[PDB]
Amino acid sequence: AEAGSRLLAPLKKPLIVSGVLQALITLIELAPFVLLVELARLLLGGAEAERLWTLGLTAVSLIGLGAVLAAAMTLWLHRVDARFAHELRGRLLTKLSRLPLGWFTRRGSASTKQLVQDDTLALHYLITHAIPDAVAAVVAPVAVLVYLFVADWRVALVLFIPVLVYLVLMSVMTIQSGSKIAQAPRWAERMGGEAGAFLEGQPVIRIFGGAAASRFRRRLDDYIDFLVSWQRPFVGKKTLMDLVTRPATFLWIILVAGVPLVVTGRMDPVNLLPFLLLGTTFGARLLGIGYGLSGIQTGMLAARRIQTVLDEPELVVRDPGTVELDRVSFEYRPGVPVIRDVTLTLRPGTVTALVGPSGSGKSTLAALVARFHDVTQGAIRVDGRDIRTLTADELYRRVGFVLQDAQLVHGSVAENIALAEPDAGLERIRTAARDAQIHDRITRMPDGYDSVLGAGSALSGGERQRVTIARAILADTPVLVLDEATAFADPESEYLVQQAINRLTRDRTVLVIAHRLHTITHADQIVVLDDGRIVEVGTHDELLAAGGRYRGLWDSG
Amino acid sequence: IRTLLRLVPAEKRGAVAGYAVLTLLSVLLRAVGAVLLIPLLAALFSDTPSDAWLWLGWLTAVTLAGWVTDTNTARLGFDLGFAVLSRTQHDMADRLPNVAMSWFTPDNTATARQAIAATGPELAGLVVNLLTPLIGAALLPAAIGVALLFVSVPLGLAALAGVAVLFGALALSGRLSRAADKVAGETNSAFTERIIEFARTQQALRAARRVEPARSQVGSALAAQHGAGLRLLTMQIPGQVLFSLAGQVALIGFAGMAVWLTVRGQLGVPEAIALIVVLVRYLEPFAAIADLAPALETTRATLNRIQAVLDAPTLPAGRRRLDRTGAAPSIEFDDVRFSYGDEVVLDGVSFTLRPGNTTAIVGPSGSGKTTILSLIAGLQQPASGRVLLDGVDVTTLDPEARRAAVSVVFQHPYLFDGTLRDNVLVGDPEADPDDVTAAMRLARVDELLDRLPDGDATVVGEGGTALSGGERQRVSIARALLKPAPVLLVDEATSALDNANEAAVVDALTADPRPRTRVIVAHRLASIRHADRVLFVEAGRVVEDGAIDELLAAGGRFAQFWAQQQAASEWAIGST
């Protein structure tokens, strides 16, 4: 809750100055109505034309002053916001360079885009458009009320009769629909999910048909009927609520309250003129306060999200490829362990395999070996040194990893393959590529190794996977954290990726996240994780002889 | 912009006419109320305020008629809003099933989902929250201009001619504001696009030890862009500020003109004061229209999304139908061409499938193999050429006959919230229990029922038991087998970890008693070992065509593919 206000801490004084300038500008914008009242005052008094000319000069000067103040405030506020947002984006760049790699996978690409590109724009709108607009929408009705009360209180009180009627009707409406107001967001979310399902199941509707369309149609009809039943009985209250705050109603009330007073001599006729000028649209100004403050909340949500990401824990640097998991345990959230006191010793040159049922947390342990997250308890040591004490530039020359959803840096193919060692000569790049079974397709490209890769490219999934495998081969890390989902991610080119992985796994301490048992039987060490902890350890033949948990998985295949 | 006329159903068209007439009456009553301040304030500020009673009576007679008319327009507004909501939602729901599958782009799907979901409560009160205030505020200044003709011809003509200038100023202000917001969004996106790339590729940069040089490069780029952007800031009046300035200038200028006429003796002082008040009444609606800028923009966006969904390219229809015999149809391709875009997916593919003979479609071209099945099923029409089923073109085929012609096993299972039997029964709900049991047996679902606690009645999919891929694929195969289609299309995208799913597919291919032609897009040895003939689709064209043994003896590309797949099946890490 405090995060949103804490992000905007340095902008307290610029925002206060902006609020003061906006209050002054808004009061200046209401100046010509006061000047018109005084114009009527001195017209009925038979003032000389020189005084009227001076009053017109004053009005023109105030109009120009208000325009200049608004332009200068907008320029200064946009400049201050431009400086602050640049500093914020620098902080975000630095933060994303030190958050753990596993933070990104949980969020995904859409959440990162929402954080960096959408919320940072909502913050710009908050600083430069929302706060000044809200200040104007709060200053204008208050100033109007004060001025009308100063003009005359008897006619100012009757302005609150329609306001009181509006508030009473709104209160009666709100209590009478207490449950439906809470239900409506839930039903909207349900209908959004059902619309997504209906759009996703289009081929089944086209080929098979049947209830796939009726399931959506019945619930859409139910939602529409819910809305109609909710809002239909309030037509009686809502039309009256709209009529009460209408400008014509305010004008009628003002005139029927003022003309008896003016006729009876209880009020100066000039004192009614402020009510006719400013008082008619007062109700519409009161209703505009809510939309003014809506922007502040909509921006503060974005500020809260940005600060919450900026408060995320970072990686802590405390203090031939043997990995020693020593009493390692891990929990995604506090109090929900996923890995529970696992012990392992990945010896050099031994292709350890990690196998288990779905949701067993094998992927989590394999990720923890590469320090996608910091182990909550225990410690993971590579070559006798805890991974916590290793910096990123020194850790990832010891523990390489080839997991699912490989990522290509924008640039030439020679850059993507040589990302770990840009200084490597082109002959070494081609040797690494040929070792990864991707030399043929790279030569097939028009520019060859100079072809520019990125987010979108002609290469399929199974080919950019082999490009990443070529990168990993050229990096030549002693330890390797391999995921077997890369093998069958692209069934069209499974054989080439399997050959690439075979060439990559050559005299390296590999940790395979097993998904198919039949590709693991030759592994040096099998690890069976039933639920967040080791159950059986040993070779394939030993586990088959044991006849325990592993035998059922082997029989299933 | 004016898409709303076609949204309302024909039933409420009389109500729309009544609403329009009553809105015009409401505007006229409001204008007469505003113009009635001329004699009322003229008498009020004179030496005999008691003469103001008659004009106050006329004003409060125009009011209460304003209330009656506004009540009627608001009632018709709520009625039309509910009617438009129901009609548009049902029409949009009916349109989408007939839309060609090519239209369902991810962005198109997103807009369709937003149109179906986000437009629930908006259309309920669209006409009452936007159209009525907008129309009233737009026509009131012109209505006061016309009504001022009776007070005085030159004054009314000037007031009516000045409405165009103020509307032009309002349009210019809106244009400037929209341009400024668009430029701000574009600049922010350009600034942050570096960081999005830096975060997307974070694993590659970190693992390659390039995170620090990459961060330094991104920071330098951000610094340079910030300096360049901050240098170009200069004095500029926003759109809203410009319009407020225009309104204040118009008010003070016309008040000064009234003062000039007063001192020259053309108008009395009470008349000048009344004209100033009517001036404020005349300039008030423009502020109301400017207040409706965000709501109007949101409604325009929603109407654009609804129009985009409704304007989707509908597929054609035909009268002719396949034979009711239900025998295996022979499928023929001739000069068939198809493309997802700049890349061609099919380039003159032509072949003929014998009736009842299995056909295996294999090759590196992943899109083309599925595209052939889609063309056979009729989901996507071919750009060129024809698709035939026993001398009947799919494009000219009856939609009901097309639906009953082809059964498909999609790559995804495409299940839904409900019982497993309900999911399997949707292929053919009219089937007897024995046929359903046979479909479950051939699809190897009985083993799943043994695994499941409550049998086929178990709730699966979005609730109950969350079935894995190997189970949901079997459920989809049961769906396809249950439907008595003359044609079966199989698309294998199964997770390689499954064991019994391959057996289920083999049983569906071979052990099915239904004599139906089968086309299978497969990657695994067991499924295509039973195929009678194979089509090798590469580079959007058929390179090989023949039987299994003939192709293997020929030693062409299919033999190399067979060797590669056989080697891939026996893969083991840490071994030759």
Ligand SMILES: [Zn+2]
């Ligand atoms: Zn801005």
